[PDB]
Amino acid sequence: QECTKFKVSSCRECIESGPGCTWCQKLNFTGPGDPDSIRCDTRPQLLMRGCAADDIMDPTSLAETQEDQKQLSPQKVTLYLRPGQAAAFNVTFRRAKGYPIDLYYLMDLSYSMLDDLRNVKKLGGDLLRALNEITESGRIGFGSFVDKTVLPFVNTHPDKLRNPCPNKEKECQPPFAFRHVLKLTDNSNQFQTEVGKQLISGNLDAPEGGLDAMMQVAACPEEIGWRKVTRLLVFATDDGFHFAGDGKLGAILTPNDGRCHLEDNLYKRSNEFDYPSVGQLAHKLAENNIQPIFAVTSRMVKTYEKLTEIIPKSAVGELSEDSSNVVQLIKNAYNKLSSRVFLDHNALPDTLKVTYDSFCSNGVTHRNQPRGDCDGVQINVPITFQVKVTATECIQEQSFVIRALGFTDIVTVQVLPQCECRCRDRSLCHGKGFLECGICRCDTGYIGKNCECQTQGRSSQELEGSCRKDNNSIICSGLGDCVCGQCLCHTSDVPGKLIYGQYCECDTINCERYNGQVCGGPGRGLCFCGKCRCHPGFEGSACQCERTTEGCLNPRRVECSGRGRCRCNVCECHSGYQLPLCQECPGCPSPCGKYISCAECLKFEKGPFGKNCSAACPGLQLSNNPVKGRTCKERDSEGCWVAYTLEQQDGMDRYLIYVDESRECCGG
């Protein structure tokens, strides 16, 4: 294929040079004048010069699989990695019909949840029914939260502390951060009676300390009573949430320690710690394999939906204002969790690059992704991820785990390096050096293919002819010393600079510069004699371009609207649409004039575009209600003025048109 010639003295040095580099071990494959540099080259240029097909040494990346759990297979893989060459193996995911499920229900007791808390009797049976419908063997339990009991979060006046509700209701409860009411239990009647027992509380500001409660639940698996089964946390609220930083208003500067603070089933020291960070909560949830379900009112759905990007295994469901639809919510939310499967890996070194190819039953295929992603995953219908692992170096003894997010089941991957030849005689090499893999490897001080010379010695004439590239060149490029016919390159003491090549004509610092570094620095790629060889995940002449397209797409995954294609994470927008995502074009002409016939077609069913219509107006969608686009008024087929509006949509010249039914004539 392709081979950069970096170090050619050895076989391993040849293999390390590039993945397309191969080695010839045939003795006396070299001509009398030919160097040993021709021993290392690609396969098309090796066999062609007369090298045998059998004695060509070409290590190749290999994946060993031992399959001999149920969901995630294979359960163990050992990789043999060659630098630059990718090894690939398949991981299979089969969604089971049923798992045991622990359902913990975090209940908001703030005064704003008054009407949701009038349904507590029904809530007991509903939550039980929801769990029974998604599980054959499940446990249930719950806890309650309001907010931190300091100002401004809570009115700390003695009177308001015993009755925080704004109205005068006898059945009220003093504010509290978080209370663990019932440990996960199989007792149904205990759950029902304890849930209905709960009273309404209240506090001052709208967002609540729910993140506090969720952090404590995730940090106390003992007191909550989690099993090693599927863990579900249902979070129900009508408003937003405090997070880290907000505590400063109550003079609270000490970070959440992610540790369990439960005294008598209470978060007593809540006024001593700040609210948890969102990332702080996300980590603790994934660490204990807890999939939270956010049961929020319609008002708060779009907000909590933003969380699912930080917390991969979570789901949002729209909660009725009375918390009556909780069952239908939980089942849909659980199915949403289970119908999507993520395949990720833990910590890697800089020398290991892993990407996934997702093959879904969904009818969608993803390739070259940092994480396995399949939506619409069905029960008993197996999906297969293809894992491609590449090493940039000859690596040490390492092992990492590939895991399906939301499940304790793992895939253990052992990583073994494949850099050597295992090829496929003494006193040969006419001196000191010992023969190795088709050539003599000389000792220190001695050098030559048959070790017939020494660096310090005669170094005569006529052999200096092979030290010149051509008649106009300086001997050994002036960057090396001619010894025994070959070139021994000079050693420059500069960070990263090495001179190599048959005539010492190549170096490692002369290439294109990105940012301020050559080839984008050691992060993006390395430089080899004029050309930049990029690391996996990078490409370009200066390794300036990045492969991912996440920077080109909008949150709705539109990919530079429909008016630009992505290159190097920069949307290349045709026409006059501007950056970043090509939504708007400020200096475009007005579209109004040319859609008058289409406007007359859609609304009034006449003009040149009657029966013509759907075929003649592909990019126009009609709205019988006013739209938020640009105003237009033109003369139709019979001369009357037709008013209409154009709201542009994603794509090439596609608009949402609203036409007024009232035309304007001089009649009328």
Partner 1 sequence: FNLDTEELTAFRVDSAGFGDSVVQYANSWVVVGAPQKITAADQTGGLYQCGYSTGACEPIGLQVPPEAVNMSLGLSLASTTSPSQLLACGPTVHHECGRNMYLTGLCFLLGPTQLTQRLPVSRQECPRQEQDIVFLIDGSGSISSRNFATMMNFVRAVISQFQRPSTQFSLMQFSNKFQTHFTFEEFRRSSNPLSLLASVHQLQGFTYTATAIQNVVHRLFHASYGARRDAAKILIVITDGKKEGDSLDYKDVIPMADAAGIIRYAIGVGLAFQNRNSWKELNDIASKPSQEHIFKVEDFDALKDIQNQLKEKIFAIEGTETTSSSSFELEMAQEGFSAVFTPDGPVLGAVGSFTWSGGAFLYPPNMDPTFINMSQENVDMRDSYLGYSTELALWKGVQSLVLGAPRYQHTGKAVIFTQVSRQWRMKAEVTGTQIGSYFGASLCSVDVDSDGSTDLVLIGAPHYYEQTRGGQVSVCPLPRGWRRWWCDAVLYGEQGHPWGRFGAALTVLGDVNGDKLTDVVIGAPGEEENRGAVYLFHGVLGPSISPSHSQRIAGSQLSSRLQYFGQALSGGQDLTQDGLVDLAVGARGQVLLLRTRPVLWVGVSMQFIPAEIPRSAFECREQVVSEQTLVQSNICLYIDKRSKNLLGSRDLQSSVTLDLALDPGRLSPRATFQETKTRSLSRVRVLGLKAHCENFNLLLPSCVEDSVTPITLRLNFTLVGKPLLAFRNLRPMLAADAQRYFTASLPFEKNCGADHICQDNLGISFSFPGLKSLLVGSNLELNAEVMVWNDGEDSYGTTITFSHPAGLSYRYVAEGQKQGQLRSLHLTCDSAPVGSQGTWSTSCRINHLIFRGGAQITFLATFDVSPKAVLGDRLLLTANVSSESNTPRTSKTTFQLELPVKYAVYTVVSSHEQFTKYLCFSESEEKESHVAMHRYQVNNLGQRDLPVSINFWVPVELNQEAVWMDVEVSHPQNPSLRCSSEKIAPPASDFLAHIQKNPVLDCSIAGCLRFRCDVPSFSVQEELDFTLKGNLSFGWVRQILQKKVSVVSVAEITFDTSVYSQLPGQEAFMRAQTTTVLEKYKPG
Ligand X SMILES: *[C@@H]1O[C@H](CO)[C@@H](O[C@@H]2O[C@H](CO)[C@@H](O)[C@H](O)[C@H]2NC(C)=O)[C@H](O)[C@H]1NC(C)=O
Residues flagged as binding site for Ca(2+) = 112, 115-116, 147, 203, 205, 207-208, 238, 321
Per rule CB under 5 A, is residue 203 in the interface with Ca ion?
A: yes
Per rule CB under 5 A, is residue 409 in the interface with Ca ion?
A: no
For every residue of 215-226, DSSP letters joined together read: HHHHH-HHHHT-
Binding residues for Ca ion, rule CB under 5 A, total: 8
Look up tokens 């000859």; give the residue. Answer: 394
Cis peptide before 382 (omega within 30 of 0): no
Look up tokens 């088709």; give the residue. Answer: 438
* Pairing status of strand 641-649 against strand 654-659: antiparallel
The one among 229, 616, 622, 656 contacting ligand X by CB under 6 A: 616
* Residue 272 CB coordination number (10 Å): 12
Per rule CB under 6 A, is residue 53 in the interface with ligand X?
A: no
The one among 42, 119, 303, 466 contacting partner 1 by CB under 8 A: 303
The one among 88, 435, 568, 643 contacting ligand X by CB under 6 A: 88
**In sequence order, what E strands does 220-351 have?**
230-237, 290-297, 315-319, 340-345
- How many Å is the Cα radius of gyration of the chain? 35
Per rule CB under 5 A, is residue 298 in the interface with Ca ion?
A: no
Cβ at position 149, least distance to partner 1 in Å = 12
Cβ at position 614, least distance to partner 1 in Å = 28
Taking phi first (over 0 means left), then psi (-120 to 50 degrees means alpha), and beta for anything else, what does residue 456 get? beta
The one among 77, 483, 484, 659 contacting partner 1 by CB under 8 A: 483
Give the amino acid at 124. G
Q: Say which entry of Ca ion, ligand X, partner 1, none residue 74 contacts (CB below 5 to 8 A, set by partner kind).
A: none
* Torsions phi, psi for 610 (to 5 deg): -85, 130
> CB-wise, 56 or 416, nearer to ligand X?
416
- Is residue 330 helix, strand or coil? helix
Cis peptide before 59 (omega within 30 of 0): no
Binding residues for ligand X, rule CB under 6 A, total: 11
Per rule CB under 5 A, is residue 147 in the interface with Ca ion?
A: yes
* Residue 268 CB coordination number (10 Å): 13
Would you list which residues are annotated within the binding site for Mg(2+)? 110, 112, 208
Stretch that binds ligand X, among 146-154, 163-171, 469-477, 610-618 (CB under 6 A): 610-618
The one among 25, 112, 297, 358 contacting Mg ion by CB under 5 A: 112
Q: What residues numbered 141-180 form the site for partner 1, per CB under 8 A? A: 151-152, 155-157, 159-160, 164, 166-167
The one among 608, 626, 639, 651 contacting ligand X by CB under 6 A: 608
The one among 493, 555, 557, 662 contacting ligand X by CB under 6 A: 493
The one among 336, 441, 630, 654 contacting partner 1 by CB under 8 A: 630
**In sequence order, what E strands does 477-536 have?**
480-483, 486-489, 513-514, 517-518, 525-528, 531-534
- Is residue 55 helix, strand or coil? coil
Cβ at position 194, least distance to ligand X in Å = 50
- What single-letter DSSP state applies at residue 521? H
| Cβ neighbours for 517, distance < 8 A, ≥ 6 positions apart | none
Q: Go through 364-375 and write b for each residue having 16 or more CB atoms within 10 A of its CB, e for each that does not.
A: eeeeeeebbbbe
Per rule CB under 8 A, is residue 348 in the interface with partner 1?
A: no
Cβ at position 471, least distance to Ca ion in Å = 53
For every residue of 185-232, DSSP letters joined together read: ES-HHHHHHHHHT--B---SSSSBSHHHHHHHHHH-HHHHT--SSEEE
Closest of 57, 32, 73 to residue 411, by C-alpha: 73
Q: Say which entry of Ca ion, partner 1, Mg ion, none residue 531 contacts (CB below 5 to 8 A, set by partner kind).
A: partner 1
Is the sign of the CA dihedral 242, 244, 249, 252 positive or negative? positive
The one among 116, 212, 246, 636 contacting Ca ion by CB under 5 A: 116
Per rule CB under 8 A, is residue 137 in the interface with partner 1?
A: no
Would you list which residues are annotated within the binding site? 110, 112, 115-116, 147, 203, 205, 207-208, 238, 321
Per rule CB under 6 A, is residue 303 in the interface with ligand X?
A: no
Is the sign of the CA dihedral 26, 29, 35, 40 positive or negative? negative
Cβ at position 113, least distance to Mg ion in Å = 6
> CB-wise, 112 or 648, nearer to Mg ion?
112
Q: Which H, E and C letters describe 592-619, residue by residue?
A: HHHCHHHHHHHHHCCHHHCCCHHHHCCC
Q: What residues numbered 561-600 form the site for ligand X, per CB under 6 A? A: none
Binding residues for partner 1, rule CB under 8 A, total: 84
The one among 251, 347, 615, 666 contacting ligand X by CB under 6 A: 615
The one among 384, 455, 569, 623 contacting ligand X by CB under 6 A: 384
Per rule CB under 8 A, is residue 117 in the interface with partner 1?
A: no
Stretch that binds Mg ion, among 34-42, 184-192, 231-239, 584-592 (CB under 5 A): 231-239
Cβ at position 266, least distance to Ca ion in Å = 18
Q: What residues numbered 648-667 form the site for partner 1, per CB under 8 A? A: 664, 666-667
- Is residue 17 helix, strand or coil? helix
Q: Say which entry of Ca ion, partner 1, ligand X, none residue 321 contacts (CB below 5 to 8 A, set by partner kind).
A: Ca ion
Q: What residues numbered 351-390 form the site for partner 1, per CB under 8 A? A: none
Q: Say which entry of Ca ion, ligand X, partner 1, none residue 488 contacts (CB below 5 to 8 A, set by partner kind).
A: partner 1
Q: How far, in Å, CA of 651 to CA of 655, rounded?
A: 9
Cβ at position 238, least distance to partner 1 in Å = 8
Enumerate binding residues for Ca ion (CB under 5 A). Answer: 115-116, 147, 203, 205, 208, 238, 321
